[PDB]
Design a protein around this nucleic acid. Sequence first.
RNA 1: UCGAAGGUGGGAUCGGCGAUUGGGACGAAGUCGUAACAAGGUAGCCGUACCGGAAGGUGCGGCUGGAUC
RNA 2: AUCAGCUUGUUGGUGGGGUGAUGGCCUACCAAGGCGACGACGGGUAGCCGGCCUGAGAGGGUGACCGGCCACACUGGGACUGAGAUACGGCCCAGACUCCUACGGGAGGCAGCAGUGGGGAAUAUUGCACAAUGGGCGCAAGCCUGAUGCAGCGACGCCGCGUGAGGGAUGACGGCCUUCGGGUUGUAAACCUCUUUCAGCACAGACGAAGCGCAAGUGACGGUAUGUGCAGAAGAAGGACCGGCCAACUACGUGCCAGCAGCCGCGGUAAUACGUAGGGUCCGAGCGUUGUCCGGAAUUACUGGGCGUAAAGAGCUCGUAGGUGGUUUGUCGCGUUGUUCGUGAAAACUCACAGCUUAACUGUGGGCGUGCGGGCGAUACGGGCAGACUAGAGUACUGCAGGGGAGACUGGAAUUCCUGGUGUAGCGGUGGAAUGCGCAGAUAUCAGGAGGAACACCGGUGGCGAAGGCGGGUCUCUGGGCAGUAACUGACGCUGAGGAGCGAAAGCGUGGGGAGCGAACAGGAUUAGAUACCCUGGUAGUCCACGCCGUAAACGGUGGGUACUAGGUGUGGGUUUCCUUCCUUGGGAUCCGUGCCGUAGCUAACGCAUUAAGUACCCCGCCUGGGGAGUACGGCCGCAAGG
Lengths: 122, 32, 48, 131
Amino acid sequence: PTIQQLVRKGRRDKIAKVKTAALKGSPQRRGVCTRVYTTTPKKPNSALRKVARVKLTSQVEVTAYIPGEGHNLQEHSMVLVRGGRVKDLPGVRYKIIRGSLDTQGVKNRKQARSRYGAKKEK
Amino acid sequence: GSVIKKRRKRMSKKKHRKLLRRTRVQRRKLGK
Amino acid sequence: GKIIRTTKKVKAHDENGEAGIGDRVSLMETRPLSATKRWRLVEILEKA
Amino acid sequence: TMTDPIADFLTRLRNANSAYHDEVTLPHSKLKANIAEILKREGYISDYRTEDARVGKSLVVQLKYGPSRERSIAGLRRVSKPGLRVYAKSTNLPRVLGGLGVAIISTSSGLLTDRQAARQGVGGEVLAYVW
RNA sequence: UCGAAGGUGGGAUCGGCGAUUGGGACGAAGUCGUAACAAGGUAGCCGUACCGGAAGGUGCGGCUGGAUC
RNA sequence: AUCAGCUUGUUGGUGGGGUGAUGGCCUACCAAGGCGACGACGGGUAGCCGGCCUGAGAGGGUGACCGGCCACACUGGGACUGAGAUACGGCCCAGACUCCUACGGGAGGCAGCAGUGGGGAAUAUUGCACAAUGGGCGCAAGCCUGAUGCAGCGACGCCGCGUGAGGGAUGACGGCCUUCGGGUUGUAAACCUCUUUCAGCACAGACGAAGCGCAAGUGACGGUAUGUGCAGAAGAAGGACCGGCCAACUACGUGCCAGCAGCCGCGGUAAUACGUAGGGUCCGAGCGUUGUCCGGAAUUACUGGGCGUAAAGAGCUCGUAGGUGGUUUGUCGCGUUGUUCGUGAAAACUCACAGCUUAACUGUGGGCGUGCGGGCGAUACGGGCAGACUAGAGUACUGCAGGGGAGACUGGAAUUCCUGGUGUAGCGGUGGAAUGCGCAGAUAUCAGGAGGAACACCGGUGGCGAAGGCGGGUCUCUGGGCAGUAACUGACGCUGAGGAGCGAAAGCGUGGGGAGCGAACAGGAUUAGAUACCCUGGUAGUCCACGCCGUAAACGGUGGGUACUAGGUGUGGGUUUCCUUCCUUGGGAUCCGUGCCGUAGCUAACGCAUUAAGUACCCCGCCUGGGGAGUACGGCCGCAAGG
C-alpha cells in the first residue's frame, strides 16, 4: 500500500494459535484416568489404538494415547501426560508417559528403553 | 474461474435462507 | 521514514489581554502559574 | 496532475533510451538543467542544450550510444520522491553498483556526486541513481 | 465539616448452568432420488419472490466464466 | 470503537488559607470555560530500564542472575516524633483469622535469614564467622550487623580431566551371517613391559593480613588449596538413531494383529520402516522426550509482497478532515547537513593487554554507548512569509452532434372482449395426444365499438449518460460534452477516511388500472415415480401517482489524475492547406471518442499492447490457506423481507 496508508494503519501480523492448550504452559501435567478404551484409526490403517479419557489438574478433560506393547491402566489411576500428536487418530494430542506415577514401563523391552520407561537389566 | 466455487457459495446461502424462512415467527416472538 | 507534521496546544499568560484570536506570537517557558499553565507571552509578532 | 518533474525527466530519458532515440525534448527547469549537466559531466549523455519555446524555455538532451549501438546509461531510478523523502548523512552515502554508478545528491553546497560529497564531507538529499 | 467499614434501593456490566431447540464437522458397512461437469440429455450462474421429501422448479431483470450457426 | 462524546474546583481570575516551595493544593466570589476521531471518556493486561535470546540487518520475544528507579508490608483509612517516614521486626481505628483469660479484658503479623504445611511437572541447610569490605554508637579500646565473607544439598548451567599407554597372528575362541568357499566383531581379547593423571594411605602446609590492637595476640574458609612420598592398572560408561530428507544392514517372530510415525506414510507369509538378536553411525557424564521464544517465513514484505482469470478495485459520483503539488524572485533557517562542547553510571558486548598450571572466570585500557541539548557555519532540496508568470484549472465569444432528463397532448399496426351479418361441423394443441373451447351456433370471413400495454421499417458493436440506463410524433422546461478564437482570473489543481446523493429487476404501503404475459394454484400428458420440462386455464405482479428497500455475473471479474514508449487499418463529431474537375472517404494537417490487428516491453500461462495488464510520480479502497461463515453475539437502518 501507499506509505501514507501504512502510516495510518500499519502492519498487523497474523495470530498464532495456541498449541496444547490443556497443559497451560507446563511440560508435563498430572491427571486421573477417568476411562480407558480402544478405538479404530482412519481409512488406510487398521488397529486397536489404546486411549484414555483423563482429567488434568488444569481441570480440563482430554484424551491421551498409551504407547508400548501393554499397560495396566484402569479408572482412578495417577498418570502424567505430555505433548505429542499422532496423525492416525484425529482427536488425540497428548500421550501418557510410561514409567511415572502409576504407569508402568513396558515389559521385555531392550531397545530404546528410555522412551518406554524400562530399566537397564543388570 | 470455476463454477464449483459459486456452487458452494450458492448452496450455503440457499440453506441459510431456507432456515431463516423456517423460523420467522419464532424469531419475531423472541426479538420483540 | 516519512516526515509527519503535528500540532500541540499550549496555555500561556498575558497580563493586558492584548493578543487576539488568530495572531502569531512568541512564548517562553516559566514556573507553574496554575493547573496546566506553564508559558508566557513574550511579545506579539504578527497581527491578523 | 504533475507531481514529480524530476522523476518525469528520468523516465522520459529512460523510455527514449530503450527505444534508441537521439534527442529528448523537455520542459525547462533549473534543477533539470543541473541534473543534465551532472549527467553530461559523467559521460552519460552526449550533450544538452536549451531553446526558447512558445511559452517558457525547453531543454534538449542528446543521447549517446556506442559504435555497435550500446546504450550508455543502463538504469535510472528516483530515490527521494514526494511522499517519502530520503536524506543521507556524510558518513552513510550510498554506493551504486558497488561504486561503479553515480548517485546525485543535493547538498547545501550545490548538486554533487556521491564521491564528490564524500570527499567534501557533506550530506543531503539523494535525488536519483544513474548507472 | 471531612471521613474507612457497615445498612437500604434501583440500574450497568461480565460469566457458569438450563427442560426444550437450531445449524456445523467427521465417521467400515445403510435408505431416497440424479441436481452440476460433454448442448450432462430443460445451457449454467447472479440479485429477488413464491413453491416442493431432498437435491430442486418457475416467474422478472442481468452475465458468458455457453455448445452449434 | 462489537468503548464517541467527557468534565462543574471543571478551565481562568481575584482576596484570603496552607506548604520547605510554585500550583484549584483548599476556601468565598466572578467569567463559561477546558479535553476529543493525532482517539477524550470506558474495558483488558502489565512494575520500568541498563541488559538477555534470536536475526545478515531492520525487526520479533523478553525484564531470570547483576546493577539503577518505583510500589508495597494481613485488608482499608489516619496522623505523631524528626533534617528525613509505603514508618516490614512503631502508634490509632475498623474488618478476617490465630492464641491466653479468673469472662472483666488482653497478645499477634516470615513478600527479612533458616524451616513447616498446602498447590504443583518442578526449585535447597532449622550451617560457620565478623577474618576482609560496608554500616550504627562511642575520645578510644570496644559492642551490634542472617549486609557480607564462606560452607552443605541438586549433573540445574558453562569449563576442564579420568576409566589407561606400547608391541602383539596374513589376525585365538564365542556370537552373528554364509553362496557351506568364507566374512564381521578384531589388535579387539588372552599375553610381556610402562606410567600413575583423579580418587586411596602418610608428612608438611598456605596467600587472602604495608590488616587490627597499644597489647605480644590476631583466618570462618581449613589442616582446605597445594607440594613430597607409598604398592598397584590397580576404583571408574552409558544414551539415542540405521525408507528418503540425514552418518549408518542382515537373520529371526508377527502378518492390516501386535505396533511405528516430524512429512509423504509402513504392517495382510520374502518387513533394512513393527519387536528381539549380531553389526554399524552420532554423542559421551551425558543421551533422548515435552514445553516456550526467534529463525527458516520475502508467510504483515520500512529494508522486502500484491489486487484481469489464483485471495484481493467499494455499484457510481460529489465532497469534509487529511496526504500531495507547475515555472520563477527575495527572505527565515522549521525539516536537512557540517563542526565544536556537555551528557549518554557501573557491569554487559567488541578489540588489545594482563592474571589464576589451560579453560570457563577476573582485572586494566580503548571503542561501542546508534539519542538528546548548548554555541557557531551552509541554503541545493522540502517547508513558512512576501511578490511575479501562463503552459495546469475555470470563465468569456462563435459554431457542432446526440434514444441525456422532466411534464403535457397525441398516431398507427396487432392481441383480447362486446354488438351485428354469412356459415356450417369442427377448432385448439403436441414427438403423439389429452385436458379445453363448440354444435344453446365455435373456428373462419366482414362492419361497428371499448380498453390497456409496447413502439415494426430507420437500427449497427452506431450516439448520449458518473454509473444504473436511454429510441412512435409534436410542444414547453432543462443538464453535460466537443471544436475554433484565445479577450479574462492567475495554481484557484489531484485524491478523498468518515458523510451525502443517485442506484436494473424482484419485493413493501396507500389509491387507481388491468389487453397480453405470467410466480403461486388447478387439471392433461410423460414417467418406476414427475411437487418439473411439454399442453389447457390462471391470482399477485408487470402499468400509473406518491413514498419505502439499497441489492445483481451492479463485469472490462481491470479506482481516479498526469507524462513518456514502432506502426497498419475500419468508424462518429469538428476545424484548416494543396489539386480543384471546384460535386464525390479529391489528398494532406490537427483535436476529441469508439473497434480490429500488431512490434519493443510485461505475464505462470492465456494474454495486454498509445482505449496497457509497458515505463514512472500522487491519493484512496482491498488481500494474507480451504471450510466453519459473510454465519453467531452486540449495534445501526427498514412497515416487512432483509441490508
